[PDB]
Each structure stands twice: as structure tokens, then as C-alpha cells.
């Protein structure tokens, strides 16, 4: 049958598999392959030309509605990007993961297996020059353009994944199309981007399957907010999207559709939902009179007529006009000698019955140009929000205008410091009254916000000094101000002492200071190490920063600083591993980082938690040696939720204090094996260098400008 996994035997076993994913890139792509360079070779217009032809090239295994695949591709592209959550930046269209389980078999992605299959020929034709990820979004753009609407822009650069992202927790439910995440609409469990397991954002029929538009609006507003969209963007996206195509529900899905892709027979070759006798959502009908043309049909139909809920031919909730003025005003999608009546979903009526969405819809209807621009910009934002800063956007269709949601960075209008200035500045920093701990902590506070999921955060920009980061509890505002003030004076003095047009950013000084401190700690232990350093980081201002959007990067747990927000729901070590994944760390790198860090001591509020050493600020393997010493016995700290005491097994002496973050490295079976290596007699030099390599890696995660 199949081996039983350890997680099956022990549900609470640390989920290290998410870090293992950072230890290797599955798939056949060569390590030295550069997608950006390959995409640069692509003739984008040629791909777009082929996509446009495909729009009206119906394939017999999935006949195009109205003879135009446009709407289907738009839904496909929207769903690809629609799984994004601002909480951890996971989900999204960047890896084209809609192609892998579980996403490929989610109920909401029914028949998109066919949409993706239609693009196979074009994918094969251009090969590595265009990823599935880039292609699916481009397909959506061409669909929109071919139907009479100009897009705001397009960027390539999304590298294809070859498996699912194991780190994404899609929710607590054990069944698709069920919800155990909200009791009241608009009160969805934190950290989730949808209101139902297996859906993109919300239930099209209404919350809990009840056709209550006002209530639906509350889940619509919250889920979209959790996907970085406000009221105008949300209304424009829904109305813009539903200006095209139709919903499919000729009959009930539960009884007429075969198994989803992952559960379908091998002969179906990746396809699923085989019709036993089109049925997709189970809801049936077009929103507008001309489903393949951009116009004001959706907004006018919604606002100018009265709608009432009913059960459609698929047994699902949908709305019909009270009058018969729109009766059979739409041509059937396939039967040339037949017609249909427009329909509205509960989620569409929501935009009309919610007072705030209604104001936006009224404004859009009165001025089509405003409706258009809002949709154009929101579609661009939707499909590029997980791609990171402007440097990563590739191709001839990238707009000249950089949007605030890209977390743009100013240009460094000055010459960068050379090897001589660098060494100079490093001594100047170590010459200041700043301690090794202050420098390391500050460099970490700056770089640690980066998350590889949507490429946001990092030391470039020195946003640590701006709102909201400068005031985050974890960053110890008052302590932080002291360090930045000192580094700022060093920057000022240096920039003034220059005459050759050279300047240094505060962003670089923070990282350089961190490097200098680590090299010092290593020196204190008898090791001579040179940490790679590359200048070029710039100082972003508040004008390059959407402050509220950065709250999403605020940590509840920080291993390096041994900070644990006394409010977390999951065990601290689980959040630690979750966070480590965003920094692209393997279990070994995480171990080396935390262990090495504890010998230096850079804890929040300067606690001694996990600092198992008699010589702080001295990079050694003391953390592991003392952690593994059986002469010490550990016990939970009295009246504490995360702290432990390390007592001498014999004399009873309280030798150390620690958190679960520290102790997991001596408890988890795999982490302990790594700890034993670093805690060995002739392994300190290795630990020092592995710590240095990981430190350097994190400091450079957001350096897309150097790629």
C-alpha cells in the first residue's frame, strides 16, 4: 500500500519537511539556469499572437463558450493569483502551483485543468523561454485585450515550481467546501485568505450556503482585504471579471462530475471532473448580454434591475431578474438556436446591497472610464502582487510607473563605497560605543523581515527606521533609536568627508555593522573570517512605503532574538520553522544560525534565554556543548508558558534559562542529530563558518539588484 508517515503516528511532530524543500529544487532544471535571461530571449508579441489565435480555436474535448476561451482564461488567471494571503505572503500565481495538488483539485478550480491544458501547445512551443506561471497570467491578459479592454501592463519573471509549497496551511477543515473558520461573517480566523476550504475567496452562494448578500459582503470585504485589496479594487475586480463569460451548472456537480484530478483514473491523464453524462460550479448562466465583450453590461444589469434568489438547474443559489425585460436576452454559449437570461450570484448582489460597495458601483456606472481604470490597475496588482520589488519585473510590457504595492526603492544617485571605504566604515562602526550585540540585533531586525513567498521585506531600503517597523515591540524602539542615531552620525560624517561623489546609505551601514560585529565575535573565539559584503542598498523614504501593508511582516516569534509574543496559538518552535522557511533556510542552516547566535547573545531585552555560554559575544559552539551535556537536566519554569530551567543534575544548580526555541534543537529527533554534529569536539570551526554563511545569506536575500 504505502509507508505510514511519522506525522501520521505523531500529529504534532515538527514539520521540518518545509525546510527540506529549501535544501533542493526538485524538477529537471539545471542549477545554473537563469530564467530571467531566458525570458529576455522571448518574443513576447509572438506568444501573445499565438494566445490570441487560441482564443477562438475551439478544441473538441472542451468546446469554447460563445466560440471564445477568453472568459475561461481570465477565471484561470484570477484563480492562479487568487490564493495569495498577505499574512505570510504564500499562495499566489508566482510558481504556477495551480498545476499541483492540492490546489489543482480544489472544488473552486474545477475544469481549470482543461483551461491549463489548452495552453500546453504554446508552452511546448516556447519552452523554457516562458514559464507556466508567466504564461497563465499572460493568457488572462490576452483574453482581456482580445475582448476590447487594454491592460495596464505585464511583467514576466515568475519561475515555475515543480511541486506544491508544503508550508501553506490552507485551513483547519478536513473536507473541501466546508468551513470551520468563522462563526460570524467578517470574523474569519486570522491568517486565512478564504472563508471556506478549497475556495479562492468566498462561497458564491453566500456564507454557509445562505443567499444573504449583506452577510456575503462581509466575507468578501475581509478575504479581499487579506489579499491586499480595498473596496474600490474589490468591486472593480469582481465587476470587471464578471463582465465576461458565464457560470456553469447544467446539472448538480455532486452527482454528475467524476473525481477531481488527483482522484481521477490514470487514463484521464491529469484531467478531472469528467462529466458522467458543462458543469463547473453548479451555478448556471451569463452575467451579461455580450459575454465576450468589454462593456457596462454587468454593472447595468446589476444596478438597473431587481433581483431575487432562486435555485438554478444545478441546485445552487443564483439570482434572476424580477421582471422579464432581460428574459432570453443572451445567446446560449453553444446552441446557436437558443437563448438564456442573465443571472447574478449572491456575491454580485453583495456589491449592490452592501452600502459601501453600492457607492462604488454607482460611481463606476456613472463613469465607465473610472470603472475601467480601477479594474485595469487592480488586475495588474492582482496578478503581480507576489512578485516583489520592481527589479524583478521583466519584459517590454512592464509599465514605466512603479506602484506603491511593489514596495518601490529610490535610485542611488551617487557612487558606491569601495573596498577601502568599506574597511574604513567597519572600523569606524566598531570604534563607536555600539556593542557586538547591538549591531547584530539591528542588522537582524533589518534583514529578517524578508519572506521568499512574495519577495517583500529585507534590509534594502532600511525600512526598519520607518513606520511601522521602527515602533514594532520586537524591535525595541528606544534601543533601536540609539543604534540608528549612532549609525546615522557615521553616515553623515562620512558623506560630508567625501568629495568624489561617493556616498553610503544607512541601509548598507546597518548590514556592514552586523558583518563587522559577527567577524569580531568570531575573532574573539580565535577565528579569522571575512564576511562577503556588497554595497548598493538604498534608503527608502515614507513615500516608498505603504506602512499599513508592512504590518503583515511583523513577527510573533523571532528565534535569533528569542522573542515570543505571549499570544501565539501554535507552539513557538512551529512558528520558528514557519519563519525559517520564509528565509529559505534548511534545518541545518536554522540550527547553525540559532546555536551560533546564542554564543553571541542578541536577545530581545538582552535576556540570557538560551545563552548557554560563559563568554557572550564570542562565536563558539558552546550552545550545543552545553545543550547536550547530560550533566544538566531541564524542567518547565514555574508559572511560565514558554520558559524552561536547566539544572545541574547533581548539585541542583540552576545553570541556564531557555525557551522552547532553544530546547527544540535538543528534543526533535532530526534537529538533535544536527546539534550533535556541531556539539562535537572538532566541529566548532565548521559551526563558525556555517553560521557565517547563513548570516550572509539572510543579509543578501533581497538583493535582486545584484542579480
- Contact segment (CB under 8 A) with its own copies among 56-64, 136-144, 350-358, 528-536 equals 56-64
Provide the angle, in degrees to the nearest 10, between the axes of the packed helices 506-524 and 419-431: 70
Among 119, 147, 196, 516, binds Cl ion (CB under 5 A): 196
How close are the terminal C-alpha atoms of the chain, in Å?
A: 46
- Helical spans, DSSP H, in 448-533: 477-497, 506-524
Among 92, 96, 204, 601, binds ligand HEM (CB under 6 A): 204
Binding string to its own copies for residues 604 to 643, with x set by CB under 8 A, is what? Answer: ---------------------x--x-x--xxxx-------
Q: Residue 337, Cβ neighbours under 10 Å: how many?
A: 6
Examine residue 681 and tell whether it contacts its own copies (CB under 8 A).
yes
Q: How far is the CB of 112 from ligand HEM (least distance, A)?
A: 9
Q: How far is the CB of 621 from Cl ion (least distance, A)?
A: 14
Binding string to ligand HEM for residues 31 to 70, with x set by CB under 6 A, is what? Answer: ----------------------------------x-----
Q: Reduced to 3 DSSP states, what percent helix, strand and coil does the chain have, rounded to the nearest 5?
A: 45, 10, 45
Among 240, 285, 458, 610, binds ligand HEM (CB under 6 A): 240
The C-alpha cell at 452 is: 521568499
Sequence-distant (6+) residues with CB within 8 A of 216 are 185, 202, 203, 206, 207, 346, 347, 349, 350
Examine residue 654 and tell whether it contacts its own copies (CB under 8 A).
no
- Partner in contact with 517, chosen from ligand HEM, Cl ion, its own copies, none, beta carbon below 5 to 8 Å by kind: none
Examine residue 177 and tell whether it contacts its own copies (CB under 8 A).
no
Identify whether 468 is preceded by a cis peptide bond (ω within 30 of 0): yes
- Partner in contact with 241, chosen from ligand HEM, its own copies, Cl ion, none, beta carbon below 5 to 8 Å by kind: ligand HEM
Please give the Cα distance from 441 to 535 (Å, whole number).
Answer: 20
Examine residue 120 and tell whether it contacts Cl ion (CB under 5 A).
no
Examine residue 244 and tell whether it contacts ligand HEM (CB under 6 A).
yes
Q: How far is the CB of 148 from ligand HEM (least distance, A)?
A: 14
Please give the Cα distance from 72 to 54 (Å, whole number).
Answer: 12
Q: How far is the CB of 282 from ligand HEM (least distance, A)?
A: 7
Residue numbers 567-596 binding Cl ion by CB under 5 A: 579, 586-588
Please give the Cα distance from 291 to 599 (Å, whole number).
Answer: 65
Contact assessment for residue 643 and residue 637, using Cβ atoms and an 8 Å cutoff: yes
Q: How far is the CB of 428 from its own copies (least distance, A)?
A: 35
| Phi/psi of residue 508, nearest 5 degrees | -70, -40
Nearest of 356, 288, 275, 331 to residue 148 by alpha carbon: 288
Examine residue 218 and tell whether it contacts ligand HEM (CB under 6 A).
no
- Partner in contact with 529, chosen from ligand HEM, Cl ion, its own copies, none, beta carbon below 5 to 8 Å by kind: none
Three state DSSP letters for 287-323 = CCCCCCCCCCHHHHHHHHCCEEEEECCCCCEEEEECC
Examine residue 697 and tell whether it contacts its own copies (CB under 8 A).
no
- Partner in contact with 10, chosen from Cl ion, its own copies, ligand HEM, none, beta carbon below 5 to 8 Å by kind: its own copies
Among 150, 334, 649, 685, binds its own copies (CB under 8 A): 649
- Partner in contact with 195, chosen from Cl ion, ligand HEM, its own copies, none, beta carbon below 5 to 8 Å by kind: Cl ion
- Contact segment (CB under 8 A) with its own copies among 23-31, 224-232, 289-297, 345-353 equals 23-31
Which residue pairs, CB below 8 angstroms and at least 24 apart, start in 414-420?
Answer: 414/501, 414/502, 414/503, 415/500, 415/501, 415/502, 415/503, 416/502, 416/535, 416/536, 417/502, 417/503, 417/504, 417/508, 417/535, 418/502
- Helical spans, DSSP H, in 498-556: 506-524, 547-550
Rg (alpha carbons) of the chain, rounded to whole number: 28
242: annotated binding-site residue?
Answer: yes
Contact assessment for residue 399 and residue 152, using Cβ atoms and an 8 Å cutoff: yes
Among 307, 364, 375, 665, binds Cl ion (CB under 5 A): 307
Identify whether 102 is preceded by a cis peptide bond (ω within 30 of 0): yes
Among 466, 582, 628, 687, binds Cl ion (CB under 5 A): 466
Please give the Cα distance from 553 to 583 (Å, whole number).
Answer: 12
Among 281, 449, 475, 613, binds ligand HEM (CB under 6 A): 281
Examine residue 301 and tell whether it contacts Cl ion (CB under 5 A).
no
Instruction: Identify the active-site residue in 68, 79, 248, 642.
Output: 79
Among 164, 177, 424, 467, binds its own copies (CB under 8 A): 164
The C-alpha cell at 294 is: 468589454
Q: How many residues bind its own copies (CB under 8 A)?
A: 99
Nearest of 699, 688, 676 to residue 597 by alpha carbon: 688
Examine residue 89 and tell whether it contacts Cl ion (CB under 5 A).
no
Among 105, 347, 579, 668, binds ligand HEM (CB under 6 A): 347
Residue numbers 513-552 binding Cl ion by CB under 5 A: 542, 547
Greatest alpha-carbon span in the chain: 93
Examine residue 46 and tell whether it contacts its own copies (CB under 8 A).
no
Q: Residue 267, Cβ neighbours under 10 Å: how many?
A: 6
H-run or E-run covering 558: strand 557-558
Contact assessment for residue 468 and residue 547, using Cβ atoms and an 8 Å cutoff: yes
Which of 291, 457 has the CB closer to ligand HEM? 291
Which of 6, 489 has the CB closer to its own copies? 6
Sequence-distant (6+) residues with CB within 8 A of 544 are 404, 407, 408, 409, 410, 461
The C-alpha cell at 320 is: 434572476
Q: Environment class of residue 177 by beta-carbon count within 10 Å: exposed (0-12), middle (13-18) or buried (19+)? A: middle
- Contact segment (CB under 8 A) with its own copies among 94-102, 370-378, 396-404, 476-484 equals 94-102
Among 3, 336, 355, 548, binds its own copies (CB under 8 A): 3
Which of 148, 259 has the CB closer to its own copies? 259
Residue numbers 258-277 binding its own copies by CB under 8 A: 261-263, 265-270
Q: How far is the CB of 12 from its own copies (least distance, A)?
A: 8
Among 9, 335, 355, 707, binds its own copies (CB under 8 A): 9
Which of 97, 242 has the CB closer to Cl ion? 97
Among 94, 202, 257, 592, binds ligand HEM (CB under 6 A): 202
- Partner in contact with 273, chosen from its own copies, ligand HEM, Cl ion, none, beta carbon below 5 to 8 Å by kind: none
Examine residue 644 and tell whether it contacts its own copies (CB under 8 A).
yes
Is 79 designated active site?
A: yes
Helix count and strand count (H, E) for the chain = 26, 11
Q: 461 - beta bridge partners?
A: 539
Q: Which residues are annotated as a binding site for heme b?
A: 242
By the criterion CB under 6 A, which residues form the site for ligand HEM? 65, 71-72, 74-75, 78, 201-202, 204, 220, 237-238, 240-242, 244-249, 280-281, 283, 345, 347, 379
Q: Where in the sequence numbering do the catalytic residues fall? A: 79
Amino acid at each position: 500500500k504505502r509507508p505510514k508517515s511519522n506525522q501520521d503516528w505523531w500529529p504534532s511532530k515538527l514539520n521540518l519537511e518545509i525546510l527540506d524543500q529549501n535544501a533542493r529544487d526538485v524538477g529537471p532544471v539545471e542549477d545554473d539556469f537563469d530564467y530571467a535571461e531566458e525570458f529576455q530571449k522571448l518574443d513576447l508579441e509572438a506568444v501573445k499572437s499565438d494566445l490570441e489565435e487560441l482564443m477562438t480555436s475551439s478544441q473538441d474535448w472542451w468546446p469554447a463558450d460563445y466560440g471564445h476561451y477568453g472568459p475561461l482564461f481570465i477565471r484561470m488567471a484570477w484563480h492562479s493569483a487568487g490564493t495569495y494571503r498577505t499574512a505570510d505572503g504564500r499562495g499566489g500565481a508566482a510558481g504556477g502551483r495551480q498545476r499541483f495538488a492540492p490546489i489543482n483539485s480544489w472544488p473552486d478550480n474545477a475544469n481549470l485543468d482543461k483551461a491549463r491544458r489548452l495552453l500546453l501547445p504554446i508552452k511546448q512551443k516556447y519552452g523554457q523561454k516562458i514559464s507556466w506561471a508567466d504564461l497563465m497570467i499572460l493568457a488572462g491578459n490576452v483574453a482581456i485585450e482580445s475582448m476590447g479592454f487594454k491592460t495596464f501592463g505585464y511583467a514576466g519573471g515568475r519561475e515555475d515550481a515543480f511541486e506544491e509549497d508544503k508550508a501553506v496551511n490552507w485551513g483547519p477543515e478536513d473536507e473541501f467546501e466546508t468551513q470551520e473558520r468563522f462563526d460570524e461573517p467578517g470574523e474569519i480566523q486570522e491568517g486565512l485568505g478564504a472563508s471556506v476550504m478549497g475556495l479562492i475567496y468566498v462561497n458564491p452562494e453566500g456564507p454557509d450556503g445562505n443567499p444573504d448578500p449583506e452577510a456575503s459582503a462581509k466575507n468578501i470585504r475581509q478575504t479581499f482585504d487579506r489579499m491586499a485589496m480595498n473596496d474600490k479594487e474589490t468591486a472593480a475586480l469582481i465587476a470587471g471579471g464578471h463582465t465576461f463569460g458565464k457560470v456553469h451548472g447544467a446539472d448538480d456537480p455532486e452527482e454528475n462530475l467524476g473525481p477531481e484530478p488527483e482522484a481521477a483514473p490514470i487514463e484521464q491523464q491529469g484531467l478531472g471532473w469528467q462529466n458522467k453524462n458543462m458543469i463547473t460550479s453548479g451555478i448556471e448562466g451569463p452575467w451579461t448580454q455580450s459575454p465576450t465583450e468589454w462593456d457596462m453590461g454587468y454593472i447595468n444589469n446589476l444596478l438597473d434591475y431587481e433581483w431575487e434568489p432562486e435555485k438554478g438547474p444545478g441546485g445552487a443559489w443564483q439570482w434572476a431578474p424580477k421582471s422579464e425585460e432581460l428574459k432570453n436576452s443572451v445567446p446560449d454559449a453553444h446552441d446557436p438556436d437558443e437563448k438564456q437570461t442573465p443571472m447574478m450570484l449572491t456575491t454580485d448582489i453583495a456589491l449592490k446591497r452592501d452600502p459601501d460597495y453600492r457607492e462604488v458601483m454607482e460611481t463606476f456606472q456613472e463613469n465607465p472610464m473610472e470603472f475601467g481604470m480601477n479594474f485595469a490597475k487592480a488586475w495588474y496588482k492582482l496578478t503581480h502582487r507576489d512578485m516583489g520589488p520592481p527589479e524583478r519585473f521583466l519584459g517590454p510590457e512592464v509599465p514605466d510607473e512603479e506602484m506603491i504595492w511593489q514596495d518601490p526603492l529610490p535610485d542611488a544617485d551617487y557612487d558606491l563605497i569601495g573596498d577601502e571605504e568599506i574597511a574604513e566604515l567597519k572600523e569606524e562602526i566598531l570604534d563607536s560605543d555600539l556593542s557586538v550585540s547591538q549591531l547584530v540585533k539591528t542588522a537582524w531586525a533589518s534583514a529578517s523581515t524578508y519572506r521568499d513567498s512574495d519577495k517583500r521585506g529585507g534590509a534594502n531600503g532600511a525600512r526598519l527606521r520607518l513606520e511601522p517597523q521602527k515602533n514594532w515591540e520586537v524591535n525595541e524602539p528606544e534601543q533601536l533609536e540609539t543604534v540608528l542615531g549612532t549609525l546615522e552620525n557615521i553616515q553623515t560624517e562620512f558623506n560630508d568627508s567625501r568629495s568624489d561623489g561617493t556616498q553610503v546609505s544607512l541601509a548598507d551601514l546597518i548590514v556592514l555593522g552586523g558583518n563587522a560585529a559577527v567577524e569580531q565575535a568570531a575573532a574573539n573565539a580565535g577565528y579569522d573570517v571575512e564576511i562577503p559584503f556588497e554595497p548598493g542598498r538604498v534608503d527608502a523614504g515614507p513615500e516608498h512605503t505603504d506602512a499599513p501593508s508592512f504590518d503583515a511582516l511583523k513577527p510573533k516569534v523571532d528565534g535569533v532574538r528569542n522573542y515570543i509574543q505571549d499570544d501565539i496559538t501554535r507552539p513557538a518552535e512551529e512558528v520558528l520553522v514557519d519563519n525559517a522557511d520564509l528565509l529559505n533556510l534548511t534545518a541545518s542552516e536554522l540550527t547553525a544560525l540559532i546555536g551560533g547566535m546564542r554564543s553571541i547573545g542578541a536577545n530581545y531585552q538582552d535576556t540570557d534565554l538560551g545563552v548557554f555560554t560563559d563568554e557572550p559575544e564570542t562565536l563558539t559552539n558552546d550552545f550545543f556543548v552545553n545543550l547536550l551535556d547530560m550533566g544538566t537536566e531541564w524542567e518547565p519554569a514555574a508559572d511560565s508558558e514558554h520558559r524552561y530551567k536547566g539544572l545541574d543534575r547533581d548539585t541542583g544548580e540552576v545553570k541556564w534559562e531557555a525557551t522552547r526555541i532553544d530546547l527544540i534543537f535538543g528534543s526533535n529527533d532530526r534537529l538533535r542529530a544536527i546539534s550533535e554534529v556541531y556539539g562535537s569536539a572538532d566541529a566548532e570551526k565548521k559551526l563558525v563558518h556555517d553560521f557565517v554563511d547563513t548570516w550572509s545569506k539572510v543579509m543578501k536575500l533581497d538583493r535582486f539588484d545584484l542579480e
